[PDB]
Ligand binder design. Structure first.
Ligand SMILES: CC(C)(C)NC(=O)[C@@H]1C[C@@H]2CCCC[C@@H]2CN1CC(=O)[C@H](Cc1ccccc1)NC(=O)[C@@H](NC(=O)COc1cccnc1)C(C)(C)S(C)(=O)=O
Lengths: 99, 99
């Protein structure tokens, strides 16, 4: 599909068993999800956005379907207002910018 | 161009006569540049992301050339590690996401 940028490019994702709305975010190196209690091991991490840094939990090799396209990789979980799909997963679904 | 996402989507922009590198960010509502001088009036504004809110200076109707494509719009100037081109200007240059 093609997604214009008139509005926030929000799409439906699936992770664990839980559809969510998430932002396709070319300016994000990583994928950051709103607080959720995912199973399995994780590592503490700091990530920095416009306001400064926040603490997150890094989970690896988590399957996540984005607009029906399967991906699997690292997801960071913490107090973000918005679910973010970053480049680590956008590449897996063959997403490009075009102009 | 078509731009893939295995690296940060950085491009050269020209603004107020000067060349800068900037990040094409579909996650950003707005365009935020590192501290710099720009001509004309500005208004204080606040903007928020991961890690919270910052103060910026809002300049309206500013010409920027982004990877060879012209835009004229709102540019915020404030503390960021990265010049950011957000949707307000990505739309002007006809940028879409595709997968
Ligand atoms: C720029 C503006 C203020 C207008 N909007 C945003 O920041 C919105 C805020 C949104 C609401 C809050 C959650 C994040 C979303 C998306 N987010 C856009 C994301 O694409 C932002 C845009 C951004 C990019 C680089 C530096 C700062 C910010 N991405 C991130 O915050 C991301 N940061 C980076 O990708 C790398 O950041 C650097 C780079 C170099 C030095 N220091 C930090 C990230 C989400 C923290 S991460 C590392 O991908 O988890």
């Amino acid at each position: 599909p093609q997604i214009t940028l008139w509005k926030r490019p929000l799409v439906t994702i699936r992770i664990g068993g839980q559809l969510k709305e998430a932002l396709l975010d070319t300016g994000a190196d990583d994928t950051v999800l709103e607080e959720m209690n995912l199973p399995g091991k994780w590592k503490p991490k700091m990530i920095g956005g416009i306001g400064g840094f926040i603490k997150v939990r890094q989970y690896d090799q988590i399957p996540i379907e984005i607009c029906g396209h399967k991906a699997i990789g690292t997801v960071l979980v913490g107090p973000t207002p918005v679910n973010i799909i970053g480049r680590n997963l956008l590449t897996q679904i063959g997403c490009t910018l075009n102009f």
